[PDB]
Structures are given as structure tokens and as C-alpha cells.
């Protein structure tokens, strides 16, 4: 089947970027004069289930051409791969997809990829896409420049892409007049675009069950008990009481960060990670990204970074999984300062310990603050520019 | 002979599921017009003799529809599964049946049924089912999405389910007036649907044997006797010494999660066991069923699921089976724990050594409340919802 751009939902920021690529193929010649050179290939990374295969088919249906791809999870390799691009040179615009790249990058199948990319010619209108959830086992060769050299981050969606999915998946369902899909939204926190296509296909289920021939209210609202328990589960959600806990591990990063001198500005609070570092992806970058290397800013940073560890502790006298992330990358910081601003494992863990003290004290010295955003962020789920720079007045 | 849900026992929550499947087949028009897309294949589990064949046939019955089957303990089977689908094309509701498909899924029998799935139309109402007892040696290609994406789980029975197995077959056999089946039922504790279906027709043989025409109580208490020894056995049923070891067990689980502040709440504890878990089932499913992952509740969980090993130990100084299935999952928690929340074999032995510890001081002390919920469970074997919620009450 074709789809296009309009059967996706809250990927705003991925489909901006990949609007230059439908350019690019649709008319090649407009590129090539004014001396314009465009990637070899694109690489888009996210959690399962959040559309990664259905942008790359959107993009194939946008523009009208040709769309060759293979799988990673079905690797007489060698010479698959030299035939799926000989087809795509005999068509001028073309498509070459590879799903599941970290699958195949045996050692014969990556060499022969490698030869092809170099091999083809870039002008002629051709483009190479792949796709991924574990980016940080990926052979180094494959990310070198002239291959691969550019990331696109696919995020979880919030309450308004939430709603916005549902929408999609219901156009050719008969509905009753009770359905409010924004209420429905509210009560998913933490599902994905495939679990929410898989909660509409059971609550038709429910109705047909009983020879009725509209779906209401009650059929949507027993669908979700029934999708996440049973010898057949299919999602996770997050209960009243985890949402708690993960409010005030986002709320001590942004407390922390308002009260240290050198701490960065804060523009967005939710309860869903957007980030590729809120993901738990390095992408083989740097961690270091100031041209100047202070002491100062330096343990700035590392009191803020150290922020949700520390409302944990003051509030739950807990851990979870995230804070233990966080103190890793604290400890790596702590061993570059130590061999740039002048045994050496006992003066590491001293520099990690004081910050920590530090961020636990500024906890429990406005403590109040702490509370009233947390109540504000457990009925809205997000806070964001405009909204965000009142509150944060209105406090401190 | 033709069998309905009238001749079946005990298998009140299997029926419910099996429910729209006969709706399903009396008239897919109803599912088509409203988009309702239903599963490919449904698999049964369970232990042997428990009426796997009999649900299977018993789904036939209630809709009136041909029924094709085979059974894989007889595998030219290539050209078998090729003839079967094509009967079941030709005729538009249909049933397939494949009995013990561990014995199959010989490489060139499971691609051919692999083609076959994909191959046909369930819009025209065509159904695949399958059995086993032996689920977790499939191979993973038979449980991929589109392919037996859909399982039930079927239970021994309970004292209420025996008595009414036992009127089933008997309601063409003249009996006399001191025949008492639910005194029949309290004394077979472990039976399963076909044990108590041999044991009816070794009560009529003694009868016979003496030329009487009506079966009294003696032969039905003469007839347990000759079931569970001698040269030609067919039975195992649980003694009074066992069921002391066995409650014992049970109400260590209850009382330490019960203590735990972070501990699940109990709805039913029972001699028999009931769920998927408790019949040493893991169904190709994660074991952890949580968003966030903190270790607070981890430790929680852990404790609680080595309360049953704790009260052996106290109490008899023993160890049996499901004590040892017990801490072969919890060892597997605790190297997750080790993973996420931060020489690797040593850690992990501290660990669930610590826990160990942790629930057998709460076996100690509270040891009197312990004793009292023993008594109440060898007299009803069974206590469920609003009366427990009673019992726990007045006990901690
Ligand atoms: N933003 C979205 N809008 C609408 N449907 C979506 C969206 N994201 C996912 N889906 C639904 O999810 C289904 C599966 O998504 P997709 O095949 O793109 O998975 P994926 O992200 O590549 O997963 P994986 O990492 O497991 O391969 C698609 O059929 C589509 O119906
Ligand atoms: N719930 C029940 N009610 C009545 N009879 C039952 C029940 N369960 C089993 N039986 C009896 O058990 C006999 C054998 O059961 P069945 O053929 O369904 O076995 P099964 O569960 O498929 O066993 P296996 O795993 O050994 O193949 C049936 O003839 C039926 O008489
Ligand atoms: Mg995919
Ligand atoms: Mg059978
Ligand atoms: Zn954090
Ligand atoms: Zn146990």
C-alpha cells in the first residue's frame, strides 16, 4: 500500500528535515547547478515501534519513484546486495532502503557494501536510507565521511501526537457520539504509534462480539485493561504511581540548574523524553562541546547533572535506573578535569562526592518550590517556553 | 460423536475467551463491515488431560461448520498439509486443527505450513488451532505476528470442577440413594478430567462383576483404591502428609508480601495451582512488567518470591521442586538488577543471599499468624476474594 506524509503523527521535527530529500529527487538538475552536494546516506535511530519503516515509505510515496529495499534480519549475501544496487542505477531517481542495518554491520556482506557505496554516483539521484534502535554497536566504518554521515532521532509521542494518531487509525470506523479520543489520550502516557493501532483493532473487536455496529466509550475504555495483562500483553504504561517518582527526578534538574551561577537556561519540562542524550544514545560524539574548559562551568555542570539522583533520595530515599545513568556520566566528566586542570581514582571519586553534597543541601533549601511544580507537571505532562518562563518568575 | 460447551467442566474462563470465535464463524459479515481484523491462529496450553481436543472439538459443535484436522504424532507430509488447506478453501467457514504441533514444529513439513498461513483469506471465515503441552520448545518462526499470535491457557481443576466432571458422566448410569458426588469430590484432590472419567467405569465393573444394577457407594470408594496402585496404575492423587507441605508453602508467599511496603496485593490462594507462572509456563514473555525499574520495589519482589522456600526451611528443614524453580528466577532478576542499576557472579550471589535472609526473619516472627491461615486451608482448599480480604484483616 502507499501512504505519504499524511498517515503520520507527531513526527514534526523528523518529517522538517527530510522535506530536502523529496526536493533533491524530485528535481536533481536544480541541485547540481549552484554546485550543491547532498549525502550518501541517512541514518534514522529510535526506540521500536515509533515509525522509523513508515517514514522511509512516506518519503518513497512523496516523491514518485522507484523504492528497492532489503532486510538485515534475513542475512550468497555478497551478491544480494551488488544486485539491489544495479537495479537502482538503471532507474535515474531512486530509493535504497536497509532495514535492521545493525543486523548485517559476514565480514564479506559489509565489505561489499562498503564497494558499493563508493561506487555509485550521487548526481544522478540516488539516495541510501537505514534504520535502527541500537546505533551504539555499529561498525565505526560504516559512520566515516562519503557514507552515512548524517542522523535523524524519532521520539515517543506526547498527549497531543497521541491523539493525533488515533485520529489516523479511526477515519473509516463507524463511531458513536459518546467517543472522546482526547480523553482517551490522557489515559495512555507512554505508548507508541503500534500500540495505539493495536488498542483500535481490539475495541472493534469487542463490539462486533456483541453484533452492534458502532464502537462507543465503553468499548475503548475495557480495550486498555485488556491489552496490558493476560498470558497475551501486548503494552506498558505508566501508573499514578510511577508518575510521581518520575516528576520530581525532571523537576530537580530544572531547580537545580535555576540556582548555580553557570547553570544553562531551562525551555521544556515533560514527563517523555525527547532527546537522543534523554534516550540513552551517545551516537559516537564527544561529551565535551565548549571551545574554553573552566573550573567553574565545569562543576556547574556537574551539580545539575547530578539534580534528579538527588531529589530521589531527599523525597523517596530511592534509586531508579535513570539517576544510575547520571552518575556514570558524571564520573567520566570527573576523570577528563582531573587530567586537564591538574592516586588519580581517589581524587575522581572526591570531586563526584562534593557535587552530590552540594545538590542534596540546594534540595532541601527550597524544598517548597520542588513541591509546586510538581503539581502543576501531574495534570498538564508538559511545560514549555512561554508558559514555562512565568512559572519559573513566579518562583525564586 | 458430536460434542458442545454442555459436555465440558471447570473451564469457565477458557469458554469466555472461545466465546467470539463462534460468533466469528456463525456470520464474519458482521466483523467485516466495521474493519474488526481477527487473529490467524489460537493456541491451547496446558498439562495432559485436562480437555485440550475436547474445547477443539467442542468450538466445532456450537457452530455448525466442517472440521478438518490432524495430528502431528503420525509424521509425503508436505503434500498432507497441502491437501488439508485445500479442503478447508473449498468449504467457506472452516476449522483447522493441528493436534501436538511440538512433535513437528521434518524442515520440509514446517515451510510448507509456514506458505499455507500466509496464503489464505480470513475474511472468508477460516480459523487455524493448535495444542500442546510442551510449549516452550517451538521454534520462534511459529509465533511471529500474522502466525498463532493468540494463546489460552487451560487449568486443572478444582473441588468445585471435579464434582461437576463427575455428574457429566453419570447422567446416563442408574444410581443408588447413598451416593454422595460431592464427598467424591472432596477425596480425589489432583485428579484431572480423564482420571475421574476412569474412575466412573471402574465403579460400574465392580458392580457387574456381582450382577447388581445399580452402583452404590462403596464401589466408588472401593475404586480410588484400584486406580493409584498396582501393576496396571493410571492416577496420582495427593496425601494428607503432602498437603501439609504444600499449604505451608502457599501461605509463606501470602504473608510476606503482605509485610513488604511495597508488596502486591493477595485475591486468591488455592492448593491447585491456577496461573500460567504457576504451571512452570514462561511463553516466550520478558519477566519484567514494569515501566520504571527502581530498587526499592525490586528488592520487594524479590523477597516475596522466596517466602515459599523460607517457610520450608523454618518449619520442616526440606526443600522441594517449586522451591528450586524459585530461586533459578529469582537469580535471573538479580543479574538484571546488576546490569541497569550498576567479579559480576560475586555481586550477584550477595544479593539474592541478602534477600534470603530478609524472609526468613519475617517467617520467625509473625510465625503465629502463619499456623492459623494452615488450618483454615486444609479444611476448604481454597480461599478467594471478599472471604480473604476478611481473614487478612483480623490476622497482621
Ligand atoms: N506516527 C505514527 N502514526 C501512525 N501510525 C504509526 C506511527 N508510528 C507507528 N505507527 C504504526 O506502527 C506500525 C508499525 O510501525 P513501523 O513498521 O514503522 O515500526 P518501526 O518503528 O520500524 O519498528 P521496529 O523498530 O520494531 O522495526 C505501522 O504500521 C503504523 O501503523
Ligand atoms: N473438563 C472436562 N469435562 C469432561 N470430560 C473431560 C474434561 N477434561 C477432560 N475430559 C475427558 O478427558 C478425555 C480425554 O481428554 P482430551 O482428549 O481432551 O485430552 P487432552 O487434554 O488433549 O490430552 P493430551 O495432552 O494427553 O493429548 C475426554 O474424553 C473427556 O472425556
Ligand atoms: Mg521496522
Ligand atoms: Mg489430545
Ligand atoms: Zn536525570
Ligand atoms: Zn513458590
Redesign the pocket.
Known amino acids: 500500500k502507499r501512504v505519504t506524509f499524511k ?5 514534526e521535527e523528523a518529517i522538517e528535515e527530510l522535506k530536502e530529500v523529496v526536493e533533491f529527487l524530485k528535481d536533481p538538475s536544480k541541485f547540481n547547478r549552484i554546485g550543491a552536494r547532498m549525502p550518501k546516506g541517512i541514518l534514522l535511530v ?1 526506540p ?7 517514514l522511509a515509505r512516506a518519503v518513497a510515496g512523496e516523491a514518485n519513484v522507484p523504492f528497492f529495499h532489503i532486510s538485515g534480519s534475513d542475512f550468497v549475501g555478497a551478491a544480494r546486495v551488488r544486485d539491489l544496487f544495479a537495479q537502482a542505477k538503471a532507474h535515474a531517481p531512486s530509493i535504497v532502503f536497509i ?2 542495518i545493525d543486523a548485517v554491520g559476514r565480514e564479506q556482506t559489509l565489505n561489499q557494501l562498503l564497494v558499493e557505496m563508493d561506487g555509485f554516483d550521487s548526481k544522478e539521484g540516488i539516495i541510501v536510507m537505514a ?1 535502527t ?1 541500537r546505533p551504539d554497536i555499529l561498525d565505526p566504518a560504516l559512520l566515516r565521511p562519503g557514507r552515512f554521515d548524517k542522523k535523524i532521532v524519532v521520539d515517543p ?1 506526547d498527549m497531543l501526537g497521541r491523539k493525533k ?1 488515533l485520529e ?2 479511526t477515519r473509516n470506523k463507524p463511531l458513536a457520539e459518546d467517543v472522546n479520543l482526547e480523553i482517551i489520550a490522557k489515559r495512555t502516557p507512554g505508548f ?3 500500540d495505539l ?1 493495536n488498542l483500535v483493532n481490539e475495541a472493534a473487536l469487542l463490539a462486533a462480539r456483541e453484533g452492534r455496529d458502532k464502537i462507543t466509550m465503553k468499548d475503548f475504555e475495557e480495550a486498555i485493561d485488556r491489552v496490558i495483562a493476560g498470558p497475551a500483553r501486548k503494552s506498558l504504561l505508566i501508573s499514578p504511581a510511577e508518575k510521581r517518582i518520575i516528576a520530581y527526578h525532571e523537576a530537580g534538574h530544572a531547580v537545580v540548574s535555576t540556582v548555580v551561577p553557570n547553570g544553562e537556561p531551562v525551555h521544556r519540562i515533560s514527563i517523555i523524553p525527547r532527546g537522543y542524550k534523554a534516550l540513552g544514545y551517545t551516537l559516537h560524539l564527544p561529551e565535551e562541546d565548549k571551545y574554553l574548559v573552566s573550573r567553574n562551568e565545569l562543576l556547574d555542570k556537574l551539580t545539575a547533572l547530578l539534580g534528579g539522583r538527588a531529589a530521589e533520595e531527599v523525597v523517596f530515599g530511592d534509586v531508579t535506573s535513570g539517576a544510575a545513568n547520571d552518575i556514570e556520566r558524571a564520573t567520566e566528566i570527573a576523570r577528563n578535569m582531573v587530567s586537564q586542570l591538574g592516586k588519580i581514582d581517589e581524587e575522581v571519586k572526591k570531586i563526584v562526592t562534593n557535587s552530590y553534597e552540594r545538590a542534596k543541601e540546594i534540595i532541601r533549601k527550597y524544598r517548597k518550590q520542588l513541591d509546586n511544580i510538581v503539581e502543576i507537571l501531574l495534570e498538564k505532562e508538559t511545560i514549555e517556553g512561554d508558559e514555562l518562563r512565568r512559572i519559573l518568575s513566579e518562583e525564586f
Open positions: 498517515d503520520v503523527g507527531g513526527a529510535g521500536p515501534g515509533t515509525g522509523k519503516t513508515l532495514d535492521e534504520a534502535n509521542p494518531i489516523i487509525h507508541v504509534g503500534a493501532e
